[PDB]
Structure formats: C-alpha cells, structure tokens
Amino acid sequence: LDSYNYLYRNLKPFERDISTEIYNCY
Amino acid sequence: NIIRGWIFGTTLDSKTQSLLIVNNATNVVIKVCEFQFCNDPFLGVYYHK
Amino acid sequence: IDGYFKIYSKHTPINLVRDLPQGFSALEPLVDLPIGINITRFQTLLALH
C-alpha cells in the first residue's frame, strides 16, 4: 500500500518541526 | 471586558508554528497554525446605539 | 510541559483598586491542551475603544 511522497529529516518528546529553512544552504 | 486573548510562539512569525487563543464574544477559538501576525495585533469592540 | 499546554484559572470578585487583595486562593485545572510546539515568547490580545 505504500510502494517521493514520504519524507524524513535533539527535540523535546511530542514536538513538531514544520520548518524547512536551511540549517550556506542545505 | 477588555483583556481578551493570548498569543504564544518562539519566534512569533510565519516560519515557526504559533498559538492563538482568542477569548472572543460567546466563544473561545484556540488555533495552532503558521500565522503571519500584525506588528500590533489586537481586537476591537465598537459600540452601536 | 512535553507538548501538553496546561491552562489554569480562577475568577474572584475583588474590591482593591490597584493591587491583589491580601488573601489566598487556588487555580483550577480546567483544560490541558495537546499542543506539540515550543513557546518562548507571548503577547496579550486586548480590546480597544
């Protein structure tokens, strides 16, 4: 059922990261 | 009935997810969205005769 | 705390004109919102005449 459409990249548990800025740009 | 609402966020911009808690008339709306806030955000009540 | 946004409150009629009256009361738990973001800055929404 699942086989581009799926992506993946410390954080506090149960947190979101919806920022796509460059961490020079990467 | 003046102080109505709150805003939360780490950078307070449209690049970081932000919180808006509006205690408006008859309701409370809590939203977590990528918001582009005003430089001086607020609400305004206007009387009618 | 850990992606849970906790809101506590209590309402009290008071007389004192400018400052907290001498006395003691505790705030109720109300709601504990599941907001999974970080907060370091905040703002107060106000009503304007």
Side-chain angles (χ1 to χ4, degrees), chain A residues 2-3 5-8 11-14 16 20 24-26, chain B, chain C:
Chain A
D2 300 73
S3 190
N5 63 7
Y6 269 70
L7 72 165
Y8 57 97
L11 277 77
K12 297 179 174 66
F14 294 154
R16 325 286 280 133
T20 179
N24 210 334
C25 66
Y26 269 70
Chain B
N1 191 3
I2 297 294
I3 303 96
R4 304 300 260 161
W6 287 259
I7 297 176
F8 293 69
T10 55
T11 58
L12 189 56
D13 207 356
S14 73
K15 184 62 66 68
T16 300
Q17 194 56 340
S18 298
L19 170 60
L20 183 63
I21 296 171
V22 186
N23 185 331
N24 75 310
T26 71
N27 198 306
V28 65
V29 182
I30 298 173
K31 306 151 102 164
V32 166
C33 317
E34 277 292 355
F35 295 115
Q36 188 35 66
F37 288 177
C38 306
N39 282 32
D40 264 357
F42 62 93
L43 71 84
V45 285
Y46 206 91
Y47 177 73
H48 202 213
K49 185 65 69 178
Chain C
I1 285 284
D2 71 331
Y4 291 165
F5 204 74
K6 303 174 185 285
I7 312 295
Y8 297 75
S9 171
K10 180 176 173 73
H11 300 350
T12 305
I14 71 151
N15 298 49
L16 276 291
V17 161
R18 321 179 73 143
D19 288 29
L20 294 174
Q22 201 280 332
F24 184 17
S25 70
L27 315 187
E28 298 184 5
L30 283 183
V31 299
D32 296 332
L33 314 182
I35 278 174
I37 63 171
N38 182 18
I39 309 294
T40 61
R41 321 186 69 266
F42 87 99
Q43 204 90 19
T44 303
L45 308 159
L46 301 169
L48 281 70
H49 274 248

